[PDB]
Design a protein around this nucleic acid. Structure first.
Ligand code: AKE
Ligand code: AKE
Ligand code: MG
Ligand code: MG
Ligand code: MG
Ligand code: MG
Ligand code: MG
Ligand code: MG
Lengths: 664, 664
DNA sequence: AGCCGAGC
DNA sequence: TGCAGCTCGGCT
DNA sequence: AGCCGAGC
DNA sequence: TGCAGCTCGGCT
């Protein structure tokens, strides 16, 4: 007692304790449905207590963490659990205020994950309790066919719980999930009350684990996770010419693209897409209009999403050309068409902004690469040559990145000895934030700590919001020692960067590990090249259909102004039959679109009466002719040519955009 | 002396030292402004300048309970940071020895709500330490920084007229004087409208700055007589109409939509709450909810306080909305502008006085407004009666689905009773609570005390539903007879009084007025709405007239084309435009009519070629005649006839909608 | 130990 | 995801 | 000793 | 308006 949000059971703590159920709900809303579902009657045997958000994995959480956790302590107090005390006999169980815990989560994967973390919590502290049948679940009277009993049934349950939640079973989880993904491919080519913990883990929780990967680990093809892809898709559909509140953009994405989660995560994703400070995006697809955070705090200083604004970068449709949309496979969420399975950008975006995310079994980490360097390599491969090797590269980073080994790099800031008493620091290594360096490095150097001596006499700061300048004073003696020991080393201006986890989803939807970024580059290249061929086939078909369509329209207009044909007072039916008999083609553009998965002459008869006038007749001829020349000008271009055009246009604008950024 | 457990404070380096009285504490409006002051001070400023942010409006300490004052976080925080002590005169220069800061600089938004926070801060210091105002303790920083001194206004205390100004603004004893104060302001501004420093005194801040807030408080809090809306509410409707959603929208998303579309200059949470309020339909809320509660919008159980978050509930227009606010009337409204953007009208003009239906209520400065709900059908019937020149029946308050009783004690005085019935000589039954008594509150504040304590009842059970109230109460046969001896409704507090002597509203001209009876409100509404039916008729005769002319010309052209009487084939634009003039075709009749508060033939020449076909020629002729009849039919009707048509349509959909509610 | 970020 | 309190006037 | 609601 | 912590993996 004395715990808020708890609706303790009436008979709890008394002689009916072991016949009392604590209902633990995912969220306050689920709690209040449990409350109205009990009525007056249920309050004797049933208590209810909400949890907000994911809970601690206690199995390898530190002791400070476990002792300080609100939720876990609240559950312990409410139920009467005691650490170390096993529940073997029946005199033990007389110490509990409740006899059962009934977990009521959303019937979604994240719901399953909470069920799992709760199960994990009991199993790790009181495994004996699991055997007595302590845990139940409420799936969403009928109210008894909704209840399911978790059954312990031997040591294959201890193995399954540990497979999901032990820091020592990461490799096991990879195998586990590899088997799962392999099975579900096989099932895709063909077709399609007690619950053991093993069956829960291996038939329900694994769906969360998989979904966690699908949402946290990006695609090779466009560098996007599904949430980020929804943000772009929504922005492309909107086509905003002026900025939008981020919070408002989030609701739009939720609605236009069937995003089924809390909008806060969306707003945060949008902020992460727009950020443009040293160590975030080499090319932000979204414009950071307002305070989106700075290198002073790693963006942690962004303003609230209801006071910041964004819109597409002019580089966005240059990187993801609208016409290629006709080539994408757009997904469906209950009969609404949403974002595509991936976009197909002109260079590999996954390398530019350096994908990163954490799933189950695997994680992704990729550093940034230089956009012009990637353009040049793509041009090289278009020439049949081999791509040059690429080092990680961060836009506006003044330091150095040197190869140390396979997928390992030294990232160094800049420190120059000015006089015998003064060093100057003008760059921090990538992802070292200014405030953090000040507090964790320079302060301890000025003040000493309990464990370290002072090393400097003073420091002064001269940063701008995008640059770094520390002026540090020392004694001639201490500077001399610092040099001998290595300035970057002493000043923590040198960090390593290790990339042995380049895990991405390939274009088929398969999770692969890539050993080098040249492998990533080459797989991207082969795919993008074939999509340029698909674009050509599509444009020839479409432009050809438009040519035909203009020819028929222009022929009618001429046949009309010469008295060769009349529609005046002719009936619909006779007009159609006259047109057929004179070899006018049914809507060619519609016919073409149709052949991509009664005769229609509306493209002709929907023309305005203006069409018959002198200038409009001339203008219609010039357009008919111009389309013909446009069909042919396209046929003369190779997929390589089309690509090289896109790349040239992109670089022109990239130069202009980066130039305006250095002035502003 | 330092300061410890005040996390958001940036203390001046020299604060609390010998150089205390040269230190300045900057109080900001919100954390946002706190960070801009922190940057503005840089590293230099951190010595003499302190920064502490206040979130929200602060306590009015003049006439506040002793408890409120002691428990309030901001006031107590300011006191610790500055080192003030209650009941100490800061008259000499020795008394100032105990302050950690010598002055406070207030930094707020330069809007009316900022002025209010300034005033409340001034009120705080003034009421506790007048002494300090003489020494010039308070200053302010005007804002849209290294040019600080031009931005820095000092407050001057010049005499007991400064005391009177502050007291007039913030004393519970000077409500009447505030009425007079604002009446002058509204009058002077009505006159000016027809026709055409460094050391601010308190009197001038109050009478030239704060009064601007007090007035804005009224403009946003007191409803209009015409449509019963406040500006926030009006903007929400205007947006809904403009949007015309055919399916539900998330409340949070609609709020963002309103802000964008109607230039709503405030936080969106307030707007989300307003939206929820507009949509509620439980007993005691709206009689006709103009927005639909799709999701959990609160219940009579908690007075709606149990509504879900605005991001998990949906809304759209009631089918009754455009029946009450007919679209055609939009053409008669004066729409407002917010700097090159057309926004909501100054009012909508509904077909019955909505201000009576859902019972307007708000609190301003000097004035407040309360109005109870009235029955929709009774109002329709009084409108009909007045249309027939009869007398309007007097009206009693009516709450949709209220099962109890509302009795008139006298003008604007009513007694509202719930329902209590004797079941047996041991048992009573409560089946209705008085209007605006919420179920959980009644249980907690009435029944519980009666069960516990000198205890009057022996037990009680609950059989509520979401929308109905049922308590069964068990009593001792002696106690019941006693309870029944006094009033049963009295003992069980099932009778409340409702008193309506503050029916203050903005009239159609924008003047604030106190109405004595609803009959007065009804008359004034009535004279204005009848007059707008006149306008709608004139407007419709004119526009339909233009449309008729437009169709006449179009039909004419078509008939002349299909007969050879006119040809456009291969004619230049000029020759064709000049020809049409010569034949007396009229430049776009509708365009011309609209402009009326070279020739344009596009309305003829933009017609499709289909127009010349048999079926289309007949359809055009039918349409032309249809419009002919429509103009004529309308010309014969009175404004009063039009009004009866709208009312009849409104009542038919009300019967349908309300029927469907009493089944779902 | 704590970052990275898309979920609750 | 939910948590946190004030203004202003009339009324009880 | 607090509701009502549009603001911060 | 801003406040509150946890997962999952790789690597510092
Ligand atoms: O529980 C949540 C939560 C739930 C659903 C959506 C969002 C949140 C949430 O943001 C949150 C907290 N936010 C603080 C800043 N981090 C930004 C990321 O959104 C803080 C605490 C918190 N829950 C507390 C209990 N969890 C502790 C583990 O047992 C939430
Ligand atoms: O300061 C605010 C605040 C500021 C701007 C917008 C909203 C709020 C706000 O909601 C708020 C609180 N919300 C509780 C729910 N009530 C309904 C209104 O949304 C609670 C406290 C609070 N500020 C605390 C300081 N005021 C203390 C007076 O001395 C705010
Ligand atoms: Mg869920
Ligand atoms: Mg990135
Ligand atoms: Mg403001
Ligand atoms: Mg109301
Ligand atoms: Mg009061
Ligand atoms: Mg970890």
């Amino acid at each position: 007692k004395g715990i808020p949000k708890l609706d303790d059971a009436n008979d709890a703590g008394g002689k009916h304790s072991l016949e009392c159920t604590l209902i633990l709900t995912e969220g306050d809303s689920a709690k209040s449905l449990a409350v109205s579902g009990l009525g007056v009657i249920g309050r004797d045997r049933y208590g209810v207590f909400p949890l907000r958000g994911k809970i601690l994995n206690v199995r390898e959480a530190s002791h400070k963490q476990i002792m300080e956790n609100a939720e876990i302590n609240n559950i312990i107090k409410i139920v009467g659990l005691q650490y170390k005390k096993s529940y073997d006999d029946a005199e033990s169980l007389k110490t509990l205020r409740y006899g059962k815990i009934m977990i009521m989560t959303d019937q979604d994967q994240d719901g399953s994950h909470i069920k799992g973390l709760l199960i994990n919590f009991i199993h790790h502290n009181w495994p004996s309790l699991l055997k007595h049948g302590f845990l139940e679940e409420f799936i969403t009277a009928d109210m008894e066919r909704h209840r399911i009993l978790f059954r312990y049934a031997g040591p294959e349950d201890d193995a399954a719980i540990t497979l999901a939640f032990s820091k020592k079973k990461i490799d096991d989880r990879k195998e586990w999930l590899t088997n799962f993904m392999e099975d579900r491919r096989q099932r895709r080519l063909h077709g399609l009350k007690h619950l053991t913990y093993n069956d829960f883990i291996n038939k329900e929780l694994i769906l969360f684990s998989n979904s966690d990967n699908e949402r946290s680990i990006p695609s090779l093809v466009d560098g996007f996770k599904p949430g980020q892809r929804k943000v772009l898709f929504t922005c492309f559909k909107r086509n905003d010419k002026r900025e939008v509140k981020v919070a408002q953009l989030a609701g739009s994405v939720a609605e236009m693209s069937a995003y089924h989660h809390g909008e806060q995560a969306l707003m945060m994703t949008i902020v992460n897409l727009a950020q443009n400070f040293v160590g975030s995006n080499n090319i932000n697809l979204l414009q950071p209009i307002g305070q989106f955070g700075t290198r002073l705090h790693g963006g942690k200083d962004a303003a609230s999403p209801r006071y910041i604004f964004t819109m597409l970068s002019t580089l966005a449709r240059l990187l993801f050309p609208a016409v290629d949309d006709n080539l994408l496979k757009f997904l469906y969420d209950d009969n609404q068409r949403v974002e595509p399975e991936w976009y197909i950008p002109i260079i590999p975006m996954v390398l530019i902004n350096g994908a990163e995310g954490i799933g189950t079994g695997w994680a992704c980490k990729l550093p940034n690469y230089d956009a012009r360097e990637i353009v040049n390599n793509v041009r090289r491969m278009l020439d049949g040559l081999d791509p040059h090797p690429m080092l990680p590269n961060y836009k506006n980073f003044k330091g150095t990145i040197q190869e140390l080994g396979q997928n390992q790099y030294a990232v160094s800031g800049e420190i120059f000895v000015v006089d015998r008493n003064t060093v100057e620091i003008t760059e921090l290594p990538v992802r070292t934030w200014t405030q953090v360096y000040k507090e964790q490095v320079l302060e301890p150097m000025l003040n000493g700590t309990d464990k370290t001596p002072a090393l400097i006499s003073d420091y002064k700061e001269y940063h701008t919001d995008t640059t770094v300048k520390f002026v540090v004073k020392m004694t001639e003696e201490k500077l001399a020692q610092a040099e001998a020991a290595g300035l970057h080393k002493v000043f923590k201006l040198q960090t390593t960067l290790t990339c042995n986890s380049m895990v991405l989803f390939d274009h088929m939807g398969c999770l692969k590990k890539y050993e080098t970024v040249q492998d990533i580059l080459k797989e991207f290249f082969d795919l993008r090249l074939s999509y340029y061929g698909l674009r050509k086939e599509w444009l020839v078909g479409m432009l050809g259909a438009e040519s035909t369509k203009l020819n028929n329209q222009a022929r009618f207009i001429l046949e009309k102004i010469q008295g060769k044909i009349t529609i005046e007072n002719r009936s619909k039916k006779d007009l159609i039959q006259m047109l057929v008999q004179r070899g006018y083609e049914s809507d060619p553009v519609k016919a073409w679109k149709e052949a991509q998965e009664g005769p229609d002459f509306n493209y002709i008869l929907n023309m305005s009466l203006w069409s018959l006038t002198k200038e409009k007749v001339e203008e219609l001829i010039k357009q008919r002719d111009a389309k013909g020349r446009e069909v042919n000008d396209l046929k003369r271009k190779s997929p390589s040519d089309l690509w090289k055009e896109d790349l040239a246009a992109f670089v022109e604008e990239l130069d202009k955009v980066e130039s305006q950024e250095r002035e502003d």
